[PDB]
Amino acid sequence: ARYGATSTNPAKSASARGSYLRVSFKNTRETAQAINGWELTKAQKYLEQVLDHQRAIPFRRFNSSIGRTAQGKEFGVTKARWPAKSVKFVQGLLQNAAANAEAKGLDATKLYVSHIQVNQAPKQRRRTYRAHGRINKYESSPSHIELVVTEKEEAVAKAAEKKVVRLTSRQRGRIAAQKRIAA
Amino acid sequence: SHRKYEAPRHGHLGFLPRKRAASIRARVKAFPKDDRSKPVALTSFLGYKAGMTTIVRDLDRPGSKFHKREVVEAVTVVDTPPVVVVGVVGYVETPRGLRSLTTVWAEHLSDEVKRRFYKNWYKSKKKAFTKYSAKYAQDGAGIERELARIKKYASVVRVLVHTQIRKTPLAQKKAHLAEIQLNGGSISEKVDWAREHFEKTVAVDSVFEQNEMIDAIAVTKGHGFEGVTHRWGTKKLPRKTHRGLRKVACIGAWHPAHVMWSVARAGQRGYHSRTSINHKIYRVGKGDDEANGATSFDRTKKTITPMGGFVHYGEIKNDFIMVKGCIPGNRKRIVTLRKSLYTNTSRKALEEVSLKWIDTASKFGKGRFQTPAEKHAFMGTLKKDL
Amino acid sequence: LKDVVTREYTINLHKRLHGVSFKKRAPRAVKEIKKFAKLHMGTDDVRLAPELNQAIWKRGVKGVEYRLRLRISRKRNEEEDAKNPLFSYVEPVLVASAKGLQTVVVEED
Amino acid sequence: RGRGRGRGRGRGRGRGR
Amino acid sequence: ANLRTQKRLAASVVGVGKRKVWLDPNETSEIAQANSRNAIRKLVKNGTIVKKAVTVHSKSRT
RNA sequence: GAAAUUGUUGAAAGGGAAGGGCAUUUGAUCAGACA
RNA sequence: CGUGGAGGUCAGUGACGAAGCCUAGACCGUAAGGUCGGGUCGAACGGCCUCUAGUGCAGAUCUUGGUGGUAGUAGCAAAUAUUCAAAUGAGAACUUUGAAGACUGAAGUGGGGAAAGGUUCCACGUCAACAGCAGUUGGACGUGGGUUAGUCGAUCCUAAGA
RNA sequence: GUGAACAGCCUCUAGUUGAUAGAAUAAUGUAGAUAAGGGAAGUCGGCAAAAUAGAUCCGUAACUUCGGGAUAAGGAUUGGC
Secondary structure, three states: OOOOOOOOOOOOEEEEEEEEEOOOHHHHHHHHHOOOOOEHHHHHHHHHHHHOOOOOEEOOOOOOOOOEOHHHHHOOOOEEEOOHHHHHHHHHHHHHHHHHHHHHOOOOOOEEEEEEEEEEOOOOEEEEEEHHHEEEEEEOOOEEEEEEEEEOOOOOOOOOOOOOOOOOHHHHHHHHHHHOOOO | OOOOOOOOOOOOOOOOOOOOOOOOOOOOOOOOOOOOOOOOEEOEEEEEEEEEEEEEEEEOOOOOOOOOEEEEEEEEEEEOOOEEEEEEEEEEEEOOEEEEEEEEEOOOOOHHHHHHOOOOOOOOOOOOOOOHHHHHOOOOHHHHHHHHHHHHOOOEEEEEEEOOHHHOOOOOOOOOEEEEEEEOOOHHHHHHHHHHOEOOEEOOOOOOOOOOEEEEEEEOOOOEEEOHHHHHOOOOOOOOOOOOOOOOOOOOOOOOOOOOOOOOOOEEEOOOEEEEEEEEEEEEOOOOOOOOOOOOOOOOOOOOOOOOOEOOOEOOOOOEEEEEOOOOOOOOOEEEEEEOOOOOOOOOOOOOOOEEEEOOOOOOOOOOOOOHHHHHHHHOOOOOOO | OOOOOEEEEEEEOOOOOOOOOOOOHHHHHHHHHHHHHHHHHOOOOEEEOHHHHHHHHHHOOOOOOOEEEEEEEEEEOOOOOOOOOEEEEEEEOOOOOOOOOOOEEEOOO | OOOOOOOOOOOOOOOOO | OOOHHHHHHHHHHHOOOHHHOEEOOOOHHHHOOOOOHHHHHHHHHOOOEEOOOOOOOOOOOO
16 A cells, blocks of 8 residues: 555555566656556557557656657657666556456446556665776666556536625625616 | 968858758749840749760860860750749738738649648548639639739749659659749739740740850758868878877867857768859750750761660650759759859850760760660670670 | 468569678578568568578578579468467578579469 | 876876976 | 486487587487486487587598 | 655746845735624 | 753643654744644653753764766677577577587697685576576576595605705 | 698687677777879878788898808799699
8 A cells, every 4th residue: 555646536446566676767757657647448559569669658857868769759759769678567567457457346448547656766786897996886776666547537526616705885885776777 | 379370261151051951952042133125034944963974066265275176075964844834923022021922823733733732642632722723613703813913013923833753764753843033024914924824834945045154053962971071171180199180170279268160060061052153055955856965067866865874863855954064963853043143244155055976875884885876886796686 | 361372582682782791691681581571471470491591501691692582481370379360481492593583473282 | 006097207297397 | 498418418428529419309308308328328229319420521632 | 764865746937047135916825803 | 042961849741642753834032942733653751940061063175874966878899600490488689409600720719637716516496686688597596416546646755945 | 731830821529609789881980901193292200001021043242350241232933734
């Protein structure tokens, strides 16, 4: 339990997570941000085309000195990549999250991903060897991945505030003057 | 301090920036000034650069050593199929410049023109200029009201022409649309000349003629990213130079603390728009006449295409213009031939050029024969034919 | 349209290995045949017979022949239903010289 | 330390007079 | 399977190097069960492992 | 289970820095007395 | 004004929640600070009158520990070179087998030893970490097996010496 | 095997095919090269590079401690049958 900041109904939702996964944190964040809010049935088809180099994952924040490509025109960006290792981990949790839906009794035609969050994990330490007999760090950046799928609903909330009226003595006598004259 | 010695500037500062052109077709920035007494005629033409060959002619230049002597000169061959007028455009005078007012198109447009307006022509429904064709379905008042506005206003009138790409050996299948200014008089007659020429073809001999000095406007052959040694022609560093020698040593002084715009730097070379002037016309050929390569001194029955055709281009089957010298741009490139903006009387022009021989040997190697019958006569018979 | 067919092609492998490094010509000729079979058959899984691999590597890395006579047969995929239902099997044709032959459709006789 | 990072002895480099 | 240890035993049993030991690829199921040198001698007898005679170095031009 | 640091969500601003002081508008929010 | 501890006092507060922490929530003081509400938390803590000190940090190329921008950037380019099919497996550019192409060219990338290492040797099982890609593989991990002398050496003799 | 040769080069026995890969072939690099006419005009300076090169035959100066200098310098020949 103890997921991120979610504003969905827990009754009509299903969750799945994965901890201490040895994948790049920067590569996983771009794939998580390129899939948030999408329908689950369209999320799984889009991720399969990334492995076939048909569509690309737009890089928005961790995108310094990335080579630009022509497949970013769909998302209005120039720099995009195909992080195949992170997609195979993200789609491995989409399959697990979708499997928990029929156990809870959720019809798969209306699931869309509403919350997905990735954050850093404790690092695995190794070392490299540099010139003049020096030793630097050589570390991985794992991540914790969690996502929640939720049923889509429409026509939620009518009946806004009542907007109580505050009138003064002179204004009540003014609005009663047009009423006795016209509509 | 002073340099050590004075040296000339490397390169020309007026040709900046050296960036890629915005289009493959070079723009016509200037047109010859209009003369009201002259009849209505075109000011430029569109063609495709085929290649180059060699001409032998007599030199008529008094006071020179090669007078009444033969010389060889390199010439360019430009394939110029007749263009088709598809519309007219009028320009009114404004304190901010020239402004387009009304564009009137023809009733029927070929698929070559419609190919220009689509990027996915194989997927489109080809609906271009379908509702505009309903303006000709009435008595004609819809087009005439837009045409009478060009006679009153729009002191500058330009015509819309397109190339017949299907008459060339190119596999590009798409016409090139351009604006050509009409140079005549009586502005009303300019739109009457354009109205009669809708869906009509004008040849190349009606615009240009023999011994005429013209200007060539085209896009330079591209070369991609280039170093500073070839882009600007700077001196190479000695062999002892560490970290490379094909560079510029000093790119600027300490003060000002910025790199100036006048220093030589690496970047894109080629694919620029250039305008070469003072090019004499040597031949105005015909596509419906055989023996284009023949001359009144050679008399042999042969056309201008070399043995095996032009390299990377093909064979000429339409009208062509032969231009002495070099033309910017490589083969298969759209070019715009334009008349001179001034009357030249330097005696390099005004001479009548009469050729003696046209070289038609193969440009795929060291050709030894001009005609296929000449190859059979010199070599006799072979094993394959007999 | 599975329509299993078997044809015999002639590939101009001299023009596909032009300006290629001498230590990569034979490896790239294997990749060019798989690209050749993908264009004419449409299948993504292309299997090359070990006898045809001996024909490319007959004269070392920089010894690829100018023309090769091949036989591409399109079959049905088995063994746990991979992504495509059809694959292409390419076999060599033992002739004196593959110089002057065109495409011939070989019937399943 | 190694053959690089030369600052001290010099033929015409720094640390002269 | 992993027939790395079977090629090492067959080289010493036959008496040649590892470059001249041939293992049947269609009969790889029963080669992996031969863990001792006594069973390796058994496969050579029935033709599962052959000798793979030497490469000819002709001296005719000499 | 704090800070540096990071993700998600929500709110706001952004023409070669950002942050601050005085004054007010706008938005959000809070209090008092109802004797 | 604030901190650690000490004497006295408020027959002070507290598992019906003490201390700590969080809080563009509130109040008091010119300020150092103090108080309250809410969230979290789980066992001790405070007001005042006095005593006492290892008693207040933004710096010292401070110490120790942790984390950033740079940045998914520099880079993973010597030693001529790999390719096809099958098998195994959740998964194969890298494992195994077959076939092909190559190299070390016998002052070798061959077969043995000395110094040194100490179980790396062999078998089976395993893939979290390690093998700066990968891995079903490994000098890795886990469990076991293995070194047989009257003739080979030490042991004996003496050299420079001790 | 070639050759004077334990040189270089190719092969047999034996042993490896292990050094992160894939796709393209911009600039600038590292390594290897070729250049018309001139031939050190370059540069502190022939730096770097180029030329010469094995064998057989001919020929070989000044000087000298009479031993050398000397492969002096300078020329010709080289396959196959």
